[PDB]
């Protein structure tokens, strides 16, 4: 209703910040066609980074949405969206709960739950059964039994429960270390070339697309934004 946007003027310049990306040892990629990367040129990075262009686009501005800020989306609105999503069908309540506890945007938490469980169909989320809607301890030895093992250990015997305990894990490493918007996660304006999430120059733009997609399904729009400014 009343978007609240904060603008941080580095006083720097897009020309400076983009060439800085080009000197990184972990060189940037460009999926000109899906499934294949190539290093991006100065224009490729300067365009993908140009917040002036990303702020004007309704799907692209979501990279500036603050992920560390819960929005009070109605729990009913959430279930209308979680409907039919395998397990997780209900419990937007368990989700609003994980959101207010850790101070983290709700859509960021749910899309993350949706990816790890394949929209509620993952065996780990499927769960007598213990559950895991966040892939906790699942990227190492045995993703299925090792994760079932974690969930069994913390009492995630029910879906609202796997959601509460898995939630503390989301955003500590990125959203809580200051990279609170998909743009900061990609370009890191406080420390450029530092702690960046991926080489693809389109990574905040793609993720902004999927987020705004969930916002539209859900029935809401973002309210807290943060746009870096170069001049
Ligand atoms: Cl702030
Ligand atoms: Cl397994
Ligand atoms: Cl994170």
Author numbering: 1 to 231
Quote the passages of the study that discuss this structure, keeping the authors' original sentences:
AtlA-gl crystallized in the P6422 space group with one molecule per asymmetric unit. In spite of the weak diffraction data, its structure is well-resolved based on the electron density maps with the exception of the two N-terminal amino acid residues and the A128-N140 loop. The crystallographic R-factor of 0.29 reflects the irreproducible crystal, its small size and the low intensity of the diffraction data. Similar to SagB, the AtlA-gl structure also shares the topological layout of AtlE. Its R-domain comprises the region from A1 to D68 and A190 to K244, whereas the L-domain comprises from Q69 to K176. In contrast to the R-lobe, the L-lobe is smaller and partially disordered. The AtlA-gl structure was solved by molecular replacement using the SagB structure as the search model. The angle of rotation of the AtlA-gl structure superimposed on the R-domains and L-domains is 39° and resulted in a screw translational component of 4.6 Å. Thus, the packing of the R-domains and L-domains in the AtlA-gl structure differs from their packing in the AtlE structure even more than in the SagB structure. In the AtlA-gl structure, the 4th turn of helix α13 is stretched out compared to the slightly longer equivalent helix α15 in SagB and the even longer helix α12 in AtlE. The mutation of the tyrosine residue Y214 in the YATD region to alanine severely affected enzyme activity, whereas mutation of Y214 to phenylalanine completely restored the substrate degrading ability.
